[PDB]
Amino acid sequence: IAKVIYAMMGNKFVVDVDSNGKYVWFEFVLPGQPMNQGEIWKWRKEVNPDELHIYISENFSRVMDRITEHIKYHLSQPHESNILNYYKKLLKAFERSKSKIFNDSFKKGVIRQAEFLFRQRSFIQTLDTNPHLLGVGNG
C-alpha cells in the first residue's frame, strides 16, 4: 500500500532525516484546506502526518471498491468451473484485507514503511538556503 500511496500522492509530502536522527514530515499546503494564516504555497513542518492517515482510510478505499467491482465483473461472465472457483477463492481471501486499512496498527506500519519511499536526501540541509526567496503571507 505504501507504493500505491507514494504513486498517488508523491507531490505533497517529503521525508528527511534531521540532525537528531528522527524522520520528519513536511507537506506542501494548497489553497482551500485547513491551515494557519498566510502560509500558502509553502512547506510546513509536521510532527505526525495527519492528512495522510485520513487519505489512506478514505481516498484509497475508492481503489479498493474498484478492485472489488472488477472482481465481481470478471466473475459475471461465463467461464470454466476451475477459474470460477479460483475467482471465488480470490475474492473470499480478498475481502478480509479491506478492513485492515482501518486498523490503527496497520496504518502505523504503512506510514513507517512509506517513510523510506518518500525520503528525499539533502532536503533539510538545502531548506531556505537561497537568500533571494522570501516567505510572505500571500505566497
Binding site: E69, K72, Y73, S76
Partner: protein, 253 residues
Amino acid sequence: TIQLTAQRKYLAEVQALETLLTRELSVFLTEPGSKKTNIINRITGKTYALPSTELLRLYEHLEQCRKQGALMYFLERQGTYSGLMLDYDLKLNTNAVPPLEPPALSRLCHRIFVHIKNSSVLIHFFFTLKPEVVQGKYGFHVLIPGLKLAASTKKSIIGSLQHDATVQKILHEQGVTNPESCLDPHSASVPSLLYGSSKLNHKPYQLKTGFELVFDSSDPDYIPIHQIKNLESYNLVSELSLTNEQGSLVRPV
C-alpha cells in the same frame, strides 16, 4: 435510505446495473437543461440520451432487477414522436377495491378509439394500477406505445377526453365520486416512469391486463378489441418503453 444499501449488497444485478451506469453510460452524458435526453434517473439527477443498443440493454437489466424486486426511480421524457401516457387521479369516496373487470377496460378502449378515429390513423394495450390501500383510493395509467404522434394532437385528444362523459359514467359504475379531473391535462406533456420505477416512498404500479385490438382502415366506426395473453414471457420494461420502436411484442405504428 438504508434499503438502498441493502439492495446494493445482496443483489448482484444491482451491482451490474451500477457498473453499467458508471462505465458504459459515462460516455452518453447529457446536460441537465438539454432536451436531447431520453432516460433520466432522479436518484442522481442523471440525464441520458442512450442509443438503441444502450436503451435495450438498460431495459433488460432493469427487467432482471425488477423481477427480483429492488427499487429505482428511472424516468423517460417523450420526444417529437412517442406513445400516449395517461394518468387517472381517481380519488374515490371509499377506499374499497373497485375491481376493474376486462369489460370496463374494453369500454374505455372503445371510447378512446372513438375519440382518436377523428384524427390521423394508419394496437397493444397495457393496464397498470396502483396497489391501492391508501386514502383517495388508487390511480390508473394506460399506455399506447404502438404509434408515434407526439404533437398537439395529443393535447386535442386530452381535451376531448376532458369533457367526455361516457368514461365518467363508466367510473360511476365502480362507484367513483370523481368522474372528472382524474385525468390530468398534462398526461402526455410530462416525463413518465418506466415499469417498476416507483415514486418516493410509494409502491410501483402493477400491471393488471393487456389488450390487442386489430387496427383496420376500412371503417372509421368499427371497434374491435382483442386481448393479449402470456405477458409473463416478455421483457415488460422493454415492451412498455415508448422509445422502444424495436419492441418484440409491439410494433412502431
